[PDB]
């Protein structure tokens, strides 16, 4: 079913704020792509893969936000008589456009964290495979669940509110599995890290946890506040979570990777 | 004739999922282009051509999926009364937009496999020529066959279902010729490869065989499930095949090429 | 509420000038992105972050202006009978689209100034954190205030003119806090700068203060000139401020950074 | 006058094929741009200009095909009752959008061939000048002639069929002049080329002659087959000629330039 | 007032040629961007600023022509009954869209000429400042003047023909001031240039003078030939002037800069 955004009329500022959020996020991710591309070579070869993954995540996020921006603009039009933006006839907005891109983002973010933790070769491949399986199952179950949010929001005609809960809970279990893999990786770093590096890797894990925990809250938003205000708040928290989880986490992880490159004698890392 | 996608009405989730699949694949291929471009120079000069071909394939795939996404959005519109996305009056969706880009993708993928296998000069040129001839004939025959899809699906007023079978079978024969060439290349690697390299090249051949085999199934889908559910499944399998056979195959092949560069003494490959 | 631009009819030259301004600013920022990307590596590694932040700012600004240009074109249409561009029925223009991109621009600009001042590590992080907090609060308060501009302009049916003043004043206080932080950074440069560097850093502070001060005037324009002429002058001052405070400030700051790099023995900086 | 494409109704497969051709060629040329930009530095500096020109040609061709694709999509719409794509009311397709871009492509292609032939300095400038004059006159005369193709095709109400022949013949004379310059350049290479280089340069000249000769046939198609089938054949041969004469010719010329760089001692060329 | 292009009906070839010119120029400038970006590092660091300015000019020109192309397509539509492209109801074309981008182009072009003349530091800054002031005043006065071209063309209901003359004459005076500055720079080159460099710098001055002089003629076209043929010829001379004054001028200037770099011992310049 269509997302809860399609069953509401929006005041000008509500709609304006949401479209600004999508534009801004797209700008953030394109600028982050430029930044990571310009700075990747400062990281040592053995960690550069994390810098490259950051670039990849920026590309994915830029496109996902840009398509949300496009769809948001196309799905609603101003109605002067009501003083509100209202659904257009032939288009329907979907918040699910972000979920399929998370298939790229989430595994990549976890993998780059494992990379900076120092895992290589088969250990790296195995942790990447576990993180991809868990993340993909989490995203797909949440993606199924998010198609029932008009039902769970009590919009007349729509049925299947229990599917929302069921698929959300299954996705939560897979989220816990990913968090357990990442905790094991951040606690068992390879390559003889310094105490500062160990603490920074732990902080990176906790930052990832805090930022990723926002997404289930936005998923549950139709249950709590199925209003225009709730939609605005949901888009705001998506914007905070997206920017933090991808760009800010990438910047922090790059700082950790640069510290490890410096501690291993990478001259560009040391001068920078 | 118009593809079977034009003769069905879509529930919101079906149409939504297909548009998300096209957007997601476009994002995957643009991010893959960025990745390959940033990492190509880690491969030794004598294998860098494969890394370059990967970049080329990403470009081709990005545009082919983006045009699919555009056309999908333009060809259908929401209908509130029916609660379904229905075909628009002036536009018709086509699934054949992917076929012509395969003219780039398929020879390039096979070629880069032959490259990493160590064939150079005239031996390389001869394998590239054979792979291009076989692949172009395969793609063109399947392309002709895919225009009789509504006829083979039993849509009234459409004739020529036998053409679907005939051109699909001819394309299958050319596919077998491609596979035979690639098997001879993966079994006769040049440049004195290590046992690990040989096994990884064989795995690459089998991965290509497995991922390319999804395309004839997707081609056959109008026969087995000419429904909206069958269309969704078709697009999902295309997404899996596209992502695997281009991006994941490129990553695996870059790993083999990097290992061969390391074993030949390429220092960037060895440090990385 | 919709910005004051939506409540006026525009002569051809007024509308034409505004759309030319948006397009020209977009061109300026894309060209600046190309320039800074091509020139970043001339700055020494310990100051290259400023060159990178300039690239980031150019990206942000390019998209912010391009989206304003798109919206401006979409929100109004020619009406030959009146000889004027008038609001279209289904779209409303918003000047607030620039405000969310300022979230990127303003902290980045301040930070790159602090970088060229020579602050590193935790001192850098702390100043970046203060400048981001102050700038985000400033931008968000001004963004809230700018939604009441038809009310402050005396357009009938719109209430809440006092919110315009209140949020503008709060934003002014946060602006003063940012200016104080930047004055402390520019007055306490690190790394033993030369007298010429010290004076150029002070000039960069005053240039930032002068260019940033145009934004509150543009914010106040609905109060003084809620006409088509006032809209034109607003957009002209916005263009001047955008170009100066981002591109010209980046060029001047790159010159200071290059001078510091030369002083510290960076050979690319010295030859250039 | 409008091109002959505007006076026909198209079956779905005819229209579909043509749009696929334009999109495919655009993808080819963008991929080619990525490839040439990634590989230009492998050529020695005294031949790198040809690699740069290949990149330029790719850019030009990509845009020329993308605009043809756009216009083709806009100029026609599906009509379900007739089962055909028919011209829209407000738009007309033009095949002349390619001709103006040839002003870039044709001189550049000839010039890069002269470059790889070894001509430098004033001799290079003189051959570039002659090739540009001849090619520009060729393109402009053919461009004038192509505006009379509805007349030459016998579409009622259109006069001036003799202009088609006259301007085509004048363009053919200028084509012969260009071929004569290129033949003299490839028969008198500079810089003491090896026999393989000499033969490969002669091959490149004959390849250019073969691929460029398709364009007058496509120009003459309105005369022989002013039908939808003839339109499809025209676009197909344009696609073959475009791809060959730009991309494949560039690849082959890069191979010659690489061989000459290896024979003059350019290490990157020798390792690759 | 709307440009004279809005008050005429266009034959198919006239409208077709104009849209081809806009597209072709956009392609030229994007290809120029790619060329200058790929070749900038061949110039020595003390002259590489000119190469960077060429890249910047390409960006600006590409966007300006692209927007003229877009606006041209949107402002007119085919009318089968009249056999002509006629103005659409809700859009009006503006030739002034190039003027604001000239704010970037003209100072940059003059400045890069002064750079290759060898002026550095404060002397360079002073000449850049004079050139920017004169050029901005020139462009703004001509921009004001070009808003009266329907009046000067004698279209009924439009007054103010004298403003066209007045602002054109003031802009001509500022053009003369620019030319005087550039003549002083080209006649007093720094860095002890060779006689060949001195003569090539003088030729660059005369080439700039010849190509820039076309713009006042195009500005005067509404007075001489306010017809569809006059519009076509104006766009043609705009295309010639744009290509020559930006791309061709950049190529010639890069040749002078390369010769100076080689004379000063820049090895990449000498090998290339
Ligand atoms: C959407 C586009 C995504 C493209 C890239 C995806 C990367 C996913 C990483 C999966 C982790 C498991 O497999 C891992 O793969 C990476 C990338 O090939 C390999 O990485 C290797 O190549 C890259 C360059 O290609 C080097 O920077 C790295 O130092 C080197 O080890 C690891 O040796 C391997 O262990
Ligand atoms: C609109 C957005 C666009 C621009 C956004 C730019 C993002 C910039 C992010 C800057 C990074 C912040 O810097 C980060 O600060 C935290 C502060 O706790 C530091 O963390 C530090 O303190 C914590 C406290 O618990 C310790 O656990 C950790 O070991 C220590 O290093 C990180 O090591 C550092 O990387
Ligand atoms: C859509 C864009 C496609 C662009 C690239 C197409 C590649 C097609 C490969 C065909 C294989 C046969 O021809 C082969 O061509 C490649 C590319 O010129 C040549 O490759 C040569 O140039 C490339 C590029 O500088 C080097 O990375 C490589 O090391 C070198 O051998 C081979 O020596 C030749 O044997
Ligand atoms: C969705 C967006 C895209 C995200 C990014 C995707 C990146 C994908 C990276 C995949 C890496 C796979 O890595 C690949 O794993 C297989 C696992 O069998 C390894 O293969 C290994 O086992 C097989 C048997 O199973 C042997 O035949 C082979 O010789 C051996 O090396 C490959 O040597 C390795 O290259
Ligand atoms: C919208 C995308 C923006 C992304 C980039 C934002 C960077 C500015 C944030 C400043 C936060 C303060 O924290 C600061 O972070 C930067 C960036 O990691 C670090 O910078 C470090 O890495 C960069 C490359 O990544 C090097 O050029 C620099 O020399 C080095 O010090 C500083 O050591 C740290 O003190
Ligand atoms: C149309 C788009 C816009 C295009 C803009 C193109 C780039 C603009 C480049 C501007 C360069 C300005 O250059 C800047 O000039 C000022 C002039 O006061 C110099 O400043 C100099 O004088 C001031 C006093 O006036 C002193 O306080 C300062 O210490 C001294 O260096 C700066 O050291 C120099 O960096
Ligand atoms: C629209 C975007 C335009 C962005 C760039 C505009 C440049 C215009 C320069 C005009 C003159 C200003 O003054 C001049 O500025 C340039 C650019 O900082 C400085 O140039 C300095 O840095 C650049 C890189 O940033 C080097 O290539 C150059 O060798 C070096 O001298 C000159 O030392 C100074 O004399
Ligand atoms: C769908 C888009 C496709 C994208 C990718 C396309 C890549 C195209 C790569 C083409 C490579 C062809 O490679 C080219 O082969 C011919 C074969 O006659 C060789 O030519 C060779 O044989 C001919 C035979 O008459 C001799 O005249 C010539 O002297 C000799 O060198 C060229 O030396 C080589 O450069
Ligand atoms: C659609 C178009 C896209 C592609 C366009 C490509 C542009 C290529 C431009 C080629 C460069 C022209 O080359 C230029 O020729 C003139 C010819 O007078 C030379 O000039 C030479 O002769 C003149 C007199 O005529 C002397 O004053 C000068 O000192 C001398 O060098 C320039 O030194 C050279 O730089
Ligand atoms: C349309 C996009 C831009 C097109 C740019 C390319 C146009 C080339 C046309 C050839 C004109 C003949 O004149 C020729 O010009 C080229 C390009 O400046 C010069 O080439 C010189 O600069 C280039 C670029 O730095 C170097 O790769 C080359 O090694 C060097 O010789 C030749 O010395 C000169 O003889
Ligand atoms: C950049 C995108 C990111 C980091 C996305 C992260 C997404 C999640 C952590 C998703 C979590 C989910 C659950 C735990 C429950 C509800 C369903 C999901 C998929 C939203
Ligand atoms: C990235 C795109 C790829 C790898 C495409 C591959 C396509 C095939 C292997 C196509 C095969 C076909 C047949 C064997 C039978 C039916 C017709 C085709 C063309 C779909
Ligand atoms: C590139 C964008 C820049 C430099 C934006 C700067 C914005 C400001 C300095 C904002 C100032 C404000 C006030 C001081 C009062 C009115 C509200 C604001 C947000 C416009
Ligand atoms: C990439 C574009 C290319 C190689 C274009 C080439 C064009 C020609 C060789 C044009 C030839 C013409 C004639 C000889 C006669 C008919 C008119 C022309 C312009 C099509
Ligand atoms: C790339 C764009 C360029 C070089 C533009 C140049 C513009 C001029 C030389 C403008 C000249 C003018 C006058 C001298 C009189 C009439 C008004 C102007 C602005 C067109
Ligand atoms: C989607 C899941 C992708 C598979 C994960 C990797 C499986 C192989 C690991 C040895
Ligand atoms: C001790 C680690 C705490 C990290 C929390 C960071 C998350 C704040 C932004 C959301
Ligand atoms: C939407 C904007 C969200 C920005 C969140 C950034 C958090 C930065 C935390 C730095 C480390 C504590
Ligand atoms: C207006 C926004 C522009 C964003 C453009 C994105 C820049 C490209 C980033 C990827 C660069 C890849 C570099 C590969 C070679 C190293
Ligand atoms: C101390 C000198 C300060 C002068 C800066 C003025 C900048 C004006 C920018 C417009
Ligand atoms: C000292 C240098 C001052 C440059 C000011 C640039 C302002 C340009 C505004 C264009 C709009
Ligand atoms: C309108 C732009 C004028 C720029 C003038 C720059 C003067 C710099 C100070 C010397
Ligand atoms: C359109 C090209 C015009 C170039 C004129 C060059 C004049 C040079 C005089 C010495
Ligand atoms: C529109 C095309 C204009 C082309 C102008 C090119 C002039 C080349 C001059 C070379 C040196 C005399």
Numbering used by the authors:
A (entry chain D), B (entry chain C), C (entry chain E), D (entry chain B), E (entry chain A): 1 to 245, 246A, 247 to 272
Q: What do the authors say?
A:
We demonstrate the capabilities of our method by studying the dynamics of the rhodopsin ErNaR (Erythrobacter sp. ErNaR belongs to a recently identified subgroup of the NDQ rhodopsins, which feature an additional glutamic acid residue close to the retinal Schiff base, allowing ErNaR to efficiently pump sodium ions even at acidic pH. Uncovering the structural dynamics of ErNaR therefore promises to shed light on the sodium pumping mechanism of this subgroup. Samples of ErNaR are activated with a nanosecond laser pulse of 532 nm wavelength (6 ns FWHM pulse duration, 6.4 mJ/cm2 fluence) and jet vitrified at 107 μs and 13.3 ms, to probe the K2 and O2 states, respectively.
Moreover, we are able to study ErNaR in its naturally occurring pentameric form, which so far has resisted crystallization. We analyze the structural dynamics of ErNaR at the level of a monomer (C5 symmetry expansion), neglecting potential cooperativity between the subunits because of the small amplitude of the motions involved.
